[PDB]
């Protein structure tokens, strides 16, 4: 007699992980970037760059 074409089956599980990193900003160099108080010459200065 002939043979029937078998086929398989499997169930795989997702194994979960996570990686994380971080940095930090100084309080001194904080107000130099965001704050819109710097009017005329402190927007294009060397310290802000």
């Amino acid at each position: 007699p002939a043979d029937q074409p078998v086929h398989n089956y499997m169930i795989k599980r997702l194994d979960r992980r996570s990686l994380n990193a971080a940095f930090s900003i100084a309080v001194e160099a904080l107000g130099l970037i965001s704050g819109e108080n710097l009017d005329g010459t402190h927007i294009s200065s060397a310290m802000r760059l």
Binding site: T41, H42, S45, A46, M47
Partner: peptide, 17 residues
């Protein structure tokens, strides 16, 4: 006034005096 190395070569208050 913050400059780079670029170069060229009232009111009436009450007080005692």
């Amino acid at each position: 006034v913050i400059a780079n190395t670029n170069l060229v070569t009232s009111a009436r208050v009450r007080a005692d005096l």
